[PDB]
């Protein structure tokens, strides 16, 4: 039971600085500094001769999956 | 003690080929001496 997150401001009112301690992070280094503005005897011999659904697991894509990777 | 695999075969193998595995080789600026011995270790090799 987490039951509540941490409100940000209890970090933000801490008196290290307005800034952090003075740690310089690599992702906070400068970059992208310029903003961009928009302007027949053999045949007779035998006996038997002559949708998109909204569910993952009941789909056609899923049963072709389980037919290939469970062999 | 039931599932984990015994260390004793790796140590057996490593001790056997240890003058080739722990060979003086090329100088890297210094060498580490094993305490209470005069055995020099020429790499950081834990099974040896």
């Amino acid at each position: 039971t987490s039951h509540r997150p941490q409100l940000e401001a209890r970090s933000g009112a801490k008196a290290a600085a307005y800034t952090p301690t003075g740690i310089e992070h690599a992702r906070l280094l400068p970059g992208h500094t310029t903003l961009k503005y928009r302007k027949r005897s053999w045949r007779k011999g035998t006996a038997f001769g002559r949708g998109y659904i909204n569910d993952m697991t009941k789909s056609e894509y899923h049963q072709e999956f389980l037919h290939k990777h469970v062999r | 003690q039931r599932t984990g695999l015994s260390q004793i075969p790796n140590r057996r193998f490593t001790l056997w080929w240890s003058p080739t595995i722990n060979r003086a080789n090329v100088y890297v600026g210094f060498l580490v001496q094993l305490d209470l011995t005069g055995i020099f270790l020429h790499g950081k090799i834990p099974t040896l």
Binding site: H3, G12, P20, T21, G22, H62, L66 | -
Partner: protein, 145 residues
């Protein structure tokens, strides 16, 4: 680098360090977002009863409805109100949608030879066993039907 190390010596390491969503804490973070989103939708349907005592009970039915989807057992609580039942069903289907498509995504990496961790290869076979049995039980039910 030396500037960062020296700043920590005289000023200390800040207590406001926010840790990112990495691959080792992804399942924990999905949990907290689904747990907060289910309590929001149910507490807005309730008139003016209570907030603290019922809440732990509601999240126990959610964890139980997820153990039933994985076991392929129907989840029926006899005296549960119908709008609380439809919120838990909607959110169990959303978790299951993520669970299945992540199993397909990781099985195709294992096939094509891409490097996957040993714990994640093993978690994949467990998911694809339960998915395989569910197709097998649905195949049996239809031949009876």
């Amino acid at each position: 680098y030396i500037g960062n190390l020296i700043t920590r010596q005289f000023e200390g390491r800040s207590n406001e360090i926010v840790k990112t969503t990495t691959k080792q804490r992804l399942d924990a973070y999905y949990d907290l977002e689904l747990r907060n989103s289910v309590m929001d939708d149910i507490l807005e349907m309730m008139p003016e009863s209570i907030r603290q005592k019922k809440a732990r009970t509601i999240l126990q039915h959610l964890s139980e409805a997820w153990r039933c989807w994985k076991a392929n057992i129907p989840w029926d609580v006899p005296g549960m109100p119908a709008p609380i039942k439809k919120i838990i069903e909607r959110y169990i289907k959303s978790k299951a949608d993520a669970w299945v498509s992540a199993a397909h995504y990781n099985r195709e990496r294992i096939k094509r030879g891409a490097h996957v961790e040993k714990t994640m290869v093993k978690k994949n076979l467990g998911r694809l066993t339960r998915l395989w049995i569910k197709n097998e039980q649905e195949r049996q039910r239809q031949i009876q039907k």
